[PDB]
Amino acid sequence: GTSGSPIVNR
Amino acid sequence: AGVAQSPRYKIIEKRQSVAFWCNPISGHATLYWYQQILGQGPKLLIQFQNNGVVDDSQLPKDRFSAERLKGVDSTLKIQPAKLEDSAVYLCASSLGQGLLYGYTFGSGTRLTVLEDLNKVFPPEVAVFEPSEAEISHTQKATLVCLATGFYPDHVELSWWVNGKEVHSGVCTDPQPLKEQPALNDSRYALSSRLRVSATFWQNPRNHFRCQVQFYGLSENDEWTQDRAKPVTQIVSAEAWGRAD
Amino acid sequence: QPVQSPQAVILREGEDAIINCSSSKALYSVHWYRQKHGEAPIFLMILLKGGEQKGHDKISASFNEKKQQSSLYLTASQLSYSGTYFCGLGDAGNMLTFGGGTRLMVKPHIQNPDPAVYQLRDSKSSDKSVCLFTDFDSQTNVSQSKDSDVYITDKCVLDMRSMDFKSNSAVAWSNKSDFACANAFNNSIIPEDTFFPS
Amino acid sequence: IQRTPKIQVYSRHPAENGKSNFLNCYVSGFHPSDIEVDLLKNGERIEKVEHSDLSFSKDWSFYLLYYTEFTPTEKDEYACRVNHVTLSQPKIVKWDRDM
Amino acid sequence: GSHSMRYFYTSVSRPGRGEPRFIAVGYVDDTQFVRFDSDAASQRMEPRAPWIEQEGPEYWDQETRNVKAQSQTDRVDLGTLRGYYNQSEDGSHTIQIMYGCDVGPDGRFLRGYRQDAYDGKDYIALNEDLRSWTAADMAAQITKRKWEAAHAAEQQRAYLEGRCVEWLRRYLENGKETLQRTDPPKTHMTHHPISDHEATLRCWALGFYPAEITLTWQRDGEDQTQDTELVETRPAGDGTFQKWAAVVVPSGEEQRYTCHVQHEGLPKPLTLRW
């Protein structure tokens, strides 16, 4: 199961 | 700065188009569009991660569409609008996804889809001076405001004392009542009371103004009625302090 | 998707209120929002596995990973606590799914109650004057006019602050010639301490 | 900086003449991801070639597996034609039944 | 023995050819189970291993959400890094993300991983503590500070130590027959004379799982580094792997050389001799 948190701009 | 949303209110006719704008918190990667029918829980429509779509499953693709082309501000369109679409269109923003991040909602766009524009009416605002039986028995004096015969429920009632807005000793009805309770398209009525000391009302150099901000039609809406177009306007009622 | 309970609650100022939110599947994050008269939902707290027990001003909240439930604790309720609270739910990406909601009503405690009806003077351009029923106890409920040509508003609460005076009030008016005070509000549960002038 | 692909032409099972099998071309250790890989039967491009989903190693270098169903014959000569930015001309690696 | 779940994401910009391409791949040790391609018609997280196909619509819905979100973040991140490194619009660039967790035979958490690379070189990495980042340059330092403000490490730790291991333990149960089998290598030796005085000895290991193998060449006890040639473990294409190791020996000295084969599925370490 993939990560959904954190998905923030780098 | 906060989440910006234009317009605050919008009246549209059954089968016409509508557009809602939203500017998220500067920097925030995620943007959400929620539809809140009446007082119920907001229902998700679309999610945006930067310039593109994460989930559009909840969007009725038949009428609804939303874009966020440069990944900043977003626009939600309804074409054509159905009566069912009368709701508050909430826009949320977050830095990204997200488990520690809470949403920041904008004020929303209150939409009312109508069967006919001729049903739109502005309010008639009248202020009411306190009773002399009240100043004698009770130590205080209360002024009653009454906005009548408006359609739809797109009013903001505010009290103004000496050019300053008042929130203390102020109480506006949470829900407006129908003048003809049977009809769903019935014109509304709403009251708000302002209570002050009996001495305050006795002083003649004190102004008591009741401001009602009505959200109606635009210059671009076609009007053919004998009465003037019920445009977005402020309708006031005022009374000066009396020692009488 | 999350089950918010109860749907509505009415309580006196200073009473405790406990509102909970349940999930069928395992939790990620539980969001809690407050909403007023056509206002934007204002974010309160966010709970997850890190913790679990959070708070906003005088309200506290719980997150029970095992029970798949979260609760909002409103101890010693203030008049400012009304009205609608929303439980929102996780998602692996934090995509929120709101609960049904909870309409909270905080009725004030009136120290010196003396029910009285008054006739307010017209400012200038009006056919008939308005009637006002005020300073009644939060237990007494105002009834709507069974006659469609008379309009009676629901009970509303004032907060004077520069006196620490709080009072309940209801407005009534009619264009009808056969309309006067005392007979206007007589339909509702009227007490014995009521004042009717003549 | 860019990395040159490492090529491997081999069969799934030990090659037996006139018996159905699979011909592989494992391309690894390359950067960028953009690669052209063709499998050949007697100098001619095979069209029924399938490739693996793009993945990468610990050192970030890419790897792919191109493959086709084939029947090895003594007369037939099978090879792999890999083209990259690190290669001026397409590199041909011949299949050897003992490598 | 030990198991791991890895996720590999690739983003390649294409100047004047359209928007960048995102490729996502999921693995349970050496077996691929999921796939995502931004250029594919489906625009959905697709199954690749049989044992993952049993997952409901809600599973594929969340997995598509997360990858679409990362896909979208990278599209912006490619131009942002192009900014930091002062590079023109004309030129293809790559962003690679590698993340996952390790568990032991007991199925207990071992390590969490999160690494990022720009143009095949290290950009930002989450340290073993899962509390801090390691920036490889002044550009990656800009990201570090942004991710420090965003509380990324704390959120990364929550997943890598929590849901990652829960999902991996779940995959091991559902795919028991294929993921937890230890297929030993079918070993054999070949002799190829390259000269009259020189010969090539090759040691093969075939149809083995996992891909972790050891092929060592020896001569009268000692190890052989000089004239020892090894190919990297290659996929057979049917879930198994292949590998060979060769050594050029002087003709007649073939019985002096031995090949030691080491594998998880092999009960005792095999020794092969010509």
B54 in Cβ contact with B48 (< 8 Å): yes
Domains identified in chain E, total number: 2
Out of E152, E181, E210, a domain closes at E181
Please give the sequence-ordered ranges of beta strands (E in DSSP) within chain E, or none if there are none: 3-12, 21-28, 31-37, 46-47, 94-103, 109-118, 121-126, 133-135, 186-193, 198-208, 213-219, 222-223, 228-230, 234-235, 241-250, 257-263, 270-273
Which tokens sit at E68?
């679409």
Task: Give me the CATH number covering residue E11.
Answer: 3.30.500.10
- Please tell me if residue C16 touches chain B, with a CB cutoff of 8 Å: no
Closest CA to B20 of B10, B30, B32: B10
Tokens matching residue D17: 């003449």
In contact, B125 and B147? CB cutoff 8 Å: yes
Between CA B213 and CA E162 the distance in angstroms is 53
Q: In what order do the strands lie in the sheet with B74-78?
A: B4-6, B18-23, B74-78, B64-67
What is the distance between the alpha carbons of residues B41 and B56, in angstroms, rounded to a whole number? 19
- Answer yes or no: do E69 and E170 share one domain: yes
What CATH number does the domain containing E224 carry? 2.60.40.10
- The residue type at B203: N
Which residues, listed in sequence order, are joined to residue B217 by a DSSP beta bridge? Answer: B231
Task: Tell me the helices (H) and strands (E) count for chain E, helix number first.
Answer: 5, 17
What angle, 0 to 180 degrees and rounded to 10, lies between the N-to-C axes of helices E138-149 and E57-84? 130
E174 and E260 within one domain: no
Rounded to the nearest 10 degrees, how much is the dihedral formed by the CA atoms of C40, C43, C48, C51? -170
Exposure of C57 by Cβ count < 10 A (0-12 exposed, 13-18 middle, 19+ buried)?
exposed
**DSSP state letters, B147-165:** EEEEBSS-EEEEEEETTEE
Would you tell me how many other CB atoms lie within 10 Å of the CB of residue E28?
24
- Give the range of the structural domain holding residue E264, as residue numbers without chain letter: 182-274
Question: What span, in angstroms and rounded, lies between the C-alpha atoms of B102 and C33?
Answer: 9
| Structural domains for chain C | 1-108 (2.60.40.10), 109-198 (no CATH)
Domains of chain B: 1-115 (2.60.40.10), 116-244 (2.60.40.10)
Token pair of C52, please? 């679990």
Backbone angles phi, psi at D44, to 5 degrees: -115, 135
E148 and E251 fall within a common domain: no
> CB neighbours of D65 closer than 8 A, spacing ≥ 6?
D24, D25, D26, D27, D51, D52, E235, E237
**Coil/strand/helix, residue E17:** coil
Asked if D12 contacts E237 with a C-beta cutoff of 8 angstroms, the reply is yes
Taking an 8 Å cut-off on Cβ atoms, the answer to whether B49 and E154 are in contact is: no
Same structural domain for residues E13 and E146? Answer: yes
Chain C residue closest in CA terms to B137: C116
Number of helical (H) and strand (E) elements in chain B, helices listed first = 2, 20
Q: Which domains does chain D have, with CATH numbers?
A: 1-99 (2.60.40.10)
What is the sign of the dihedral through the CA atoms of E133, E138, E140 and E143? positive
Which helix H or strand E contains D39, and what residues bound it? Answer: strand D36-41
What is the residue whose two structure tokens read 């390359």?
D30
Question: Resolution limit in angstroms?
Answer: 3.0
For residue E26, what is the nearest residue in chain D, using CA coordinates?
Answer: D55
- Let me know: does B157 contact B211? Beta carbons within 8 Å: yes
Q: Please indicate, yes or no, whether residues E128 and E46 belong to a single structural domain of this protein.
A: yes
Residues E145 and E209 in one domain: no
3-state secondary structure of E57: helix
Q: Are E54 and E166 part of one and the same domain?
A: yes
Tokens of B229: 């177009």
CA dist., res. C188 & res. C194, Å (int): 12
Contacts 24+ apart (CB under 8 A), E145-148: E146/A8, E146/A9, E146/A10, E147/A6, E147/A8, E147/A10
SS3 state at B36? strand
**Chosen domain end from E181, E216, E244:** E181
Q: Measured between beta carbons, which residues in chain A are less than 8 angstroms from residue C94? A: 4-5
Is the same domain home to E255 and E141?
no
Q: Any idea what the Cα angle at residue C153 is, between residues C152 and C157, rounded to 5°?
A: 140
CA atoms of E12 and E22, how far apart (whole Å) = 7
What burial class does residue B163 get, using C-beta atoms within 10 Å of its C-beta: 0-12 exposed, 13-18 middle, 19+ buried? exposed
Are E25 and E125 found together in one domain? Answer: yes
Chains meeting A at 3+ CB pairs closer than 8 A? Answer: B, C, E
Cross-strand partners of B104: B93
Concatenated DSSP letters of C47-74: EBTTBSEEEETTEEEEEETTTTEEEEEE
* Calpha distance E147→E142 (Å, rounded): 9
E228 in the same domain as E118: no
Are B87 and E102 a contacting pair, CB within 8 Å? no
Distance CA B125, CA B191 (A): 10
CB < 8 Å to B133, chain C:
116, 118-119, 197
Binding-site residue set of E for a peptide antigen: 7, 73, 84, 116, 143, 146, 159, 171
Between chain A and chain C, the number of residue pairs with CB atoms below 8 A apart is 12
Distances from the Cα of B94 to the Cαs of B32, B55, B123, E58, in angstroms? 9, 15, 39, 23
List of chain B residues whose C-beta atoms are within 8 Å of the C-beta of residue C148: 180-181
End residue of a domain, out of E181, E202, E236: E181
| Residue C95 to residue E65, Cβ atoms within 8 A | yes
Torsion-angle region of residue C57: left (phi > 0), alpha (psi -120 to 50) or beta?
Answer: left
Q: Which two tokens stand for residue B216?
A: 């109606």
What is the rounded CA–CA span in Å between residue E207 and residue E224?
25
Which residue reads 């040509």 in tokens?
C149
Distance from CA of E9 to the nearest CA of D (A): 8
Query: In the 8-state DSSP scheme, what is residue E63?
Result: H
Distance of CA E152 to the CA centre of its chain: 24
Count of CA atoms in the C-beta half-sphere (13 A) of D65: 20
Contact D27, D81 (CB under 8 A): no
- At B172, the amino acid letter reads T
Residues counted in chain A? 10
Identify which of E68, E150, E154 has the shortest CB distance to residue B96.
E150
Instruction: Give me the amino acid identity at C90.
Output: G
Residues β-bridged to residue E158: none
E77 and E163 belong to one structural domain: yes
Whether C185 contacts C133, CB under 8 Å: yes
Q: Yes or no: say if E93 and E12 are a contact pair by the CB < 8 Å rule.
A: yes
Of E137, B166, D20, E107, nearest to C159 by C-alpha is B166
Q: What distances in angstroms separate CA B12 from CA B80, B82, B109, one per listed residue?
A: 10, 10, 12
Cβ–Cβ under 8 Å, residues B94 and B103:
yes
- Report DSSP state, residue B108: -
- What Å distances lie between residue D32 and D85, E84, E124, E130, CA to CA? 8, 20, 19, 29
Report chain E residues whose CB lies below 8 A from the CB of D3. 120
E45 with E128, same domain: the answer is: yes
D9: nearest CA partner in chain E:
E234
- Give the other-Cβ count within 10 Å of C83's Cβ: 19
